[PDB]
C-alpha cells in the first residue's frame, strides 16, 4: 500500500479558479481516508471514489476541493490513511523558491511528404520557476481538448529555471478554417493574470 498527494494544476488554480487536490491511495477492512489542513480550517466536502481495478489491486482516491487564495498563502493540506498499526500521511503545499515567469515560443513544422493533411505545432515554455506549469492550446478562441496535445515533463535549464515543450498535431481542415493557433502557459509568476501566450500559423 502506497499513496500520493497531487498538487493543483496552475490551470485549475488561475483559469478555472476551482482547484482540487486528490489523495491517490493506491484488503479485509475498507480503508478510511480523511483530510486536514495546517491552519485548522475545516475541510470542504471531499468526494471519495472507490475503483475496483485492476490486476488484483484496489484503488481508492479522494478529491478535495481547495480555495485558490488559500493555496497562495502557503496552506498545507495533509491526507491520512487508516486501516482496521500505523497510518500513512501525505502533505501537499505551495512550492517554495523564487518565482520566474515563463517565456513562450510557438513553432510550426514544415510539410512532410506523404502527410500533407497534418501538421505539428510545437510550443517551447522555458526559464520559469517553480516547475508547476499548465499548457492549453486555443483554436478559434475555444480551448482544444487536453488529449489533443502532449506536454513534456518540466526539466532543468542550465540556469535555475525549468523548461517544457508542448506538441500539438493539427489537421488541414482546422488551419484552413482559421490559420491561427494560440499556445497559452499558466504560471503563478506570469503577470498579470498568470498567463503568457504566443500565436503560430501554418503557411
Amino acid at each position, epitope marked *: 500500500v502506497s499513496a500520493y498527494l497531487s498538487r493543483p494544476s496552475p490551470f485549475d488554480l488561475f483559469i478555472r479558479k476551482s482547484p482540487t487536490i486528490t489523495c491517490l491511495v493506491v484488503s479485509k477492512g475498507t480503508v478510511n481516508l*480523511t483530510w*486536514s*489542513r*495546517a*491552519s*485548522g*480550517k475545516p475541510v470542504n466536502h471531499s468526494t471519495r471514489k472507490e475503483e475496483k481495478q485492476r490486476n488484483g489491486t484496489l484503488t481508492v482516491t479522494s478529491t478535495l476541493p481547495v480555495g485558490t487564495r488559500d493555496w497562495i*498563502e502557503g*496552506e*498545507t493540506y*495533509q491526507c*491520512r490513511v*487508516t*486501516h482496521p*498499526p*500505523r*497510518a500513512l*500521511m501525505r502533505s501537499t503545499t505551495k512550492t517554495s523558491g523564487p518565482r520566474a515567469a515563463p517565456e513562450v515560443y510557438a513553432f510550426a513544422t514544415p510539410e512532410w511528404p506523404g502527410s500533407r493533411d497534418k501538421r505539428t505545432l510545437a510550443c517551447l515554455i522555458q526559464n520559469f520557476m517553480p516547475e508547476d506549469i499548465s499548457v492549453q492550446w486555443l483554436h478559434n478562441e475555444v480551448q482544444l481538448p487536453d488529449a489533443r496535445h502532449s506536454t513534456t515533463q518540466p526539466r532543468k535549464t542550465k540556469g535555475s529555471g525549468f523548461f517544457v515543450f508542448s506538441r500539438l498535431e493539427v489537421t488541414r481542415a482546422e488551419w484552413e478554417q482559421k490559420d491561427e493557433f494560440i499556445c497559452r502557459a499558466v504560471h503563478e509568476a506570469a503577470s498579470p493574470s498568470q498567463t503568457v501566450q504566443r500565436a503560430v500559423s501554418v503557411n
Partner: antibody, heavy 120, light 112 residues
Framework: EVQLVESGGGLVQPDGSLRLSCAVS?????????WNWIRQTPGKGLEWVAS???????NYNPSVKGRITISRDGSKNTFYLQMNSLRAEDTAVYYC??????????????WGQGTLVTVS | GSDIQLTQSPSSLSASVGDRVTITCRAS??????????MNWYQQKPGRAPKLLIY???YLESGVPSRFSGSGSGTDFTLTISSLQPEDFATYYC?????????FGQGTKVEI
C-alpha cells in the same frame, strides 16, 4: 514568512497584573492557525499557558485558569496575555508561538524571541 | 494532576561530534489516537527559543536536517540523531498534543 515579537516583560510585584503582547508579521492571526503562549522558568522545563485560534476560541491551561486571560486584536494583528495575581511560580520567560493543526492536534511551528517576566 | 506527564532520558549527556545520540520520552498515558502518536520534538539552543524538529513523532518539519528521526508509539518515544553536529548542542524537549493541557518533558541537554 511569520515573525513573532513579544514585549511587555519586566520586573513585577506579587499580586500585581502584567500584560504581554505578541506582534505578528507576515500573516494575519484572524486568517488561521492557533496562537499560543508558552512560558519557561529559566533552568527548568517548558509549560503551555493559553491559546486563541483564528476564530476567537480560547483555551487555557488549568494550572493558570481563573487568574490569566488571552485576548486578540485583529486590527493590530496582535494577541495579548493579561496576567493577574502574580506569583513566584509565574516568573518565567514567556514565548508566543503559532500552532499548526494536524487532524485536531496542534504543534508549535514558529516561536518568538520570548520576553522575561520576573516577580519578587 | 490528571495531565499527561512526560519523562525524558537521559536528563543530560555529553557527546562528541559524529556520535549517535538517542533520547527517550515516556508518557503517563498513551498519546496514540487514530493510528497516529501526537508526540512532537523541539530543539532549543541556549538563549534562543525552541524550534520544532518533529511532529506526530515521526514526521520532520520542513527544513529540518534528515539526521533527526522520530520513532515510537503509545507511551514510548525516541528522538534519534544519526550523527551529531556542533550546532546540535541544545536541550531537546518532547511534547504531547493528545490531550489538553499540552505538556512537555523536562528536556534532555546535549553537551558537545
Amino acid at each position: 514568512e511569520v515573525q513573532l515579537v513579544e514585549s511587555g516583560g519586566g520586573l513585577v510585584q506579587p499580586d500585581g497584573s502584567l500584560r504581554l503582547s505578541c506582534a505578528v508579521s507576515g500573516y494575519n492571526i484572524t486568517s488561521g492557525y492557533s496562537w499560543n503562549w508558552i512560558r519557561q522558568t529559566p533552568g527548568k522545563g517548558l509549560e503551555w499557558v493559553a491559546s486563541v485560534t483564528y476564530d476567537g476560541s480560547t483555551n487555557y491551561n488549568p494550572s493558570v485558569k481563573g487568574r490569566i486571560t488571552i485576548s486578540r486584536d485583529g486590527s493590530k494583528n496582535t494577541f495579548y496575555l493579561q496576567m493577574n495575581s502574580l506569583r513566584a511560580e509565574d516568573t518565567a520567560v514567556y514565548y508566543c508561538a503559532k500552532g499548526n493543526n494536524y487532524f485536531g492536534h496542534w504543534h508549535f511551528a514558529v516561536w518568538g524571541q520570548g520576553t522575561l517576566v520576573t516577580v519578587s | 494532576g490528571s495531565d499527561i506527564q512526560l519523562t525524558q532520558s537521559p536528563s543530560s549527556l555529553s557527546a562528541s561530534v559524529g556520535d549517535r545520540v538517542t533520547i527517550t520520552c515516556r508518557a503517563s498515558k498513551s498519546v496514540d489516537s487514530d493510528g497516529d502518536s501526537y508526540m512532537n520534538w523541539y530543539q532549543q539552543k541556549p538563549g534562543r527559543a525552541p524550534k520544532l524538529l518533529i511532529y506526530a513523532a515521526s514526521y520532520l518539519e520542513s527544513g529540518v536536517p534528515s539526521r533527526f528521526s522520530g520513532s515510537g508509539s503509545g507511551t514510548d518515544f525516541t528522538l534519534t540523531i544519526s550523527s551529531l553536529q556542533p550546532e546540535d548542542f541544545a536541550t531537546y524537549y518532547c511534547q504531547q498534543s493528545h490531550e489538553d493541557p499540552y505538556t512537555f518533558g523536562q528536556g534532555t541537554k546535549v553537551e558537545i
